[PDB]
């Protein structure tokens, strides 16, 4: 409906109606829900919620199905005085019912279109079950694999994260200005603003601290890119930002998000974060929490009651302007209008059962394709892989038969629809003998059974991994290792004298040195989702050819953290030339290098790259155009990820040794050759200075073209002169 | 001499003379040295140094003895045109020839007077060998025991560090305005400005980053306290501070150090740090390095040549003001005048051999006393300790006979004068049987020998530890554990069925859970210095009673780092109540608590404390006066460390759960009772806000009185009203 009519609604609402519009609740706190009704009475009483609250609530969080939504919405519109529909929001993180790989695995794809497709299918399915908003993408930069939430990020590089962030928004939303018409697309909500990934010691919800310049340089760019691409909502973070909980941080949310980033949508709190500023010790009570959160421009309080119980008295007593409340309500109403809820509150569902769109075979093919783009081949000694379909396989370990392959942050997908490793392999391989072991134990009996199976077969597929519950939210590990029983299992299998491929399933970087040394091949599958076993079988048999690259560094050991490719040089860098000396930046007990670096991954193919002549000089403001010819010089079709990095050799701030500024994943048949071109705009050459200005300085840059952050040719470009 | 005459010298100097005044060199780069003279020609050529450079150099770094000094200074004053004497500077970190405990161990003393004495004796001896300046105290706050340089800090608390930092300045300098008369005292140089201890991943020289507010709140206060107490010099740090290498950080060194902290002495570079800004990528070349370092106010370049080879051209071309040079030269001359060098350039030595004053028995008694104050008794199950002098002792392990007990940063002390553990024990105990093992191995032959010795005796003294070379500068360990052979040794010794005391010698916090669990008692000796074996024997026999408390947290495991007592609460704290739930700040695999906390330490005595009635309310600006009565309720004389912490419950910045604000180490005879009083001024109640103002806010504080950061009684005080 027209804007005038939206403003009209705001004027017509009572104060109590406006306050409750800023509250989000679980579905079973509403009448008309069709699940968990036994939770409703107790919990309404505990939150001290009344009908006047729930009949005017603004939003539902985590509806369980289309029927739940329809029922809740129908009952609510019966009794709502002005006919304002609820908006329904959900966590669709890496798929709805068709589960795609976890985001960190999608990071390893280096493939924008893979990520857009995941987001499209997610929305197709989620809208079919009546969800309007997804709490994705998660764009927290991560340098610390202790933190369980790395699984939800695309990794340690802001440029990659920004690019795949944009891809996800485009896939969920399509043309954002048509979300009232395109009812198979949904609103995206960027999270968690800001810098949540820098949690001290990888500990969940823990202190975050960095300079404002670093915040702007590394931690903000990905949220900013997704906002500029049209993300409709933003969610606050649990952590402090320079000492102030993000949720009531007026500088962060008013000056930066609403001011500088020009964000004019709904700012929704993370779960309970408005009430938690009390625990943080920056509000005395819920009256203060409410006041400060509203000052900071939080429109929507998720599942706490600070707003509903305190706003009235704050507005009555004059501590808080009613104008701040009206602008929140107006943003909530504009969101609903943007989704077409005032013309169709059932968002396409009321006379249209869209069950048919959920968990289709076409969608499964897409998740499989996503799986095979995202996996990373870390070792393959002696061309052990791909296996022949006649290879006789002993398939052993805790991930042999585990149905736990869908990943963390899988709120709607079901393990029964998932394909485990055994099932996947037996579709492809005629002889498989299986010995499943426990996640945290290695018994004598297991060793006997494993030994017997390996004696029978020709090659071992050792399937190791984490339970998904060892990561995700509030799954912090001080030591980033598998249970020791799995390292013992790999050591045992090695002694049997048969070639061993390790297929590793996990949600974070781990200490894998002992796995690489105990096997001939090592494949990082992460958690591929619904098609897990087929993803694995096709990569092992060569039906698909591994093409993923690490989007996060794999530490030598836990105490190397944080280690990441885009690091500063320091004043005493270790060089090939000073190897050995005491007074240089090094550890006495490990290498400075991570075990595996950013952008690293193997292939069954072999490629050669050639960069065309680059200029020696460039004007300020000028783009550098980078042409690369790549040839598949093997007999196997495959894909390579061309990566381009820039370094600022001398600057007024000590700049990273490399930063990724472009990438493209190129598919090549045997013998095929292609040319791709990149444009590094003058923004790629810029950075934040000690004064927090985005600047471009004259001087020397190096340009790295290659297939990892380490496997590169280097070129020099002197920037100066006049500005374009 | 008169200030006017000092100025006169500056006017009389040529440009080349002024430039060279800002250079510091090793002694064997001068004519007249009496050691390492064969290094002189090659190195002079490599640095491309001439006589005109060395005959006008401003300072000598690391003279080897009084004779080296006298010789160098005598030859130099022969040829120097205006008669400006050299100033001689050295690393006297925890003693000269009489070696005291490493600073981190001195932290654990919680004893201001112990620290002042160490500093007094250090200066007595160092001045006797002709040094004018010491590069101490090191006041870098440390939260990361991977970093080898934690040994040189007093630990994780800014208040403790500030207080002992002041004690060290007073001990070295005495009345700073009389350093021309008191020739047994010497100038102190505060280091490393600033925040060097926050090196990322505990990696030497590595990136430092934190908000400016945190910089002020936690990282600056100890340098500031030592500057205000009258420290004559400051040394720059190796690291970046918000992206700019400290050495050329104009904001840091001009605005903060010279402006806000009102420091008007010599700013000396850390070793090579002026040249190393090039490596950091914030200067293109040595011409830029010089220009920027001088702009930032660095007066004295340590052992690099940027200044001498580039200042002339910078001044000639007008890229740098000659006035900046003259003020550096004037600060250098004022330092020399403060030390009386213009009346006596040999600073008391020329007709007075003070060999007499070095390594006296009185001094040894003081280092022993320091040792016994600083050790920390971590476990003592079943009153194993103290041992009777008739106890028959198996003394085993790598520290049984090792002479490596003087600590890191022992530039002048000699192992032959040290007392090892065996020697110390046999002065006290009639029966000791010794089995020495290696630091990194545990052989079958060792086990047989250990077994035989333990069977013969009644109690095991298991002496475990680090070589000093595993810490100090550029001794970063990614995993903070002893060599695994020592853990295996402790496990083996435990199976022998005899009571075990572990005496642990080390320069950092270590993972000691496996030691505490494998023994009945555990004594943390750190590196006590020259009197090590006697420090150990006296504590073991009860001749002295352990009284140290930890000045740094001991992590459950490496991946808990950083862990520290003064932490933020977060938005989802673990409580007694919610412990068990998923969605709280916790690790899946370890406790949140460190293994041992700040301020923790045992005693052979037992004490009780009672805090007198506190007010319920306080005005802004008002001091809180805290009276504590402590009684020794045992039959053993000993010392307790009374600690007082404050918390700011609610603030505009999320404030730590506790901060130490006072402490006193109280000595009590059996049955004795004392009353001590503390004043927590309104500055103890203050903090830096989001705008970097030092503020006091009205509201609730809690006051904790006790004997650790955990063992405390808690009291509430409501601050508000008017201001004093
Ligand atoms: O689910 C919406 C957003 O909120 C958080 O998940 C909450 C968690 O913080 C809370 O403790 C539990 C209690 O039931 O529910 C979860 O829903 C996540 O941190 C957000 O990413 C999520 O989008
Ligand atoms: O000793 C003067 C100051 O120098 C640094 O020590 C240097 C070290 O950086 C350099 O690598 C070696 C070269 O041999 O000399 C050492 O003396 C220390 O970090 C400062 O704390 C010290 O006060
Ligand atoms: Mg540059
Ligand atoms: Mg307060």
Author numbering:
A (entry chain A), B (entry chain B): 1 to 724
From the paper:
In the gene cluster containing the lin1839 gene, the lin1840 gene encodes a putative glycoside hydrolase family (GH) 3 β-glucosidase (BGL) (GenBank accession number: CAC97071.1). The structure showed that Lin1840r forms a dimer of identical subunits each composed of three domains. The active center of Lin1840r is located at the interface of domains 1 and 2 as in the cases of known GH3 BGLs.
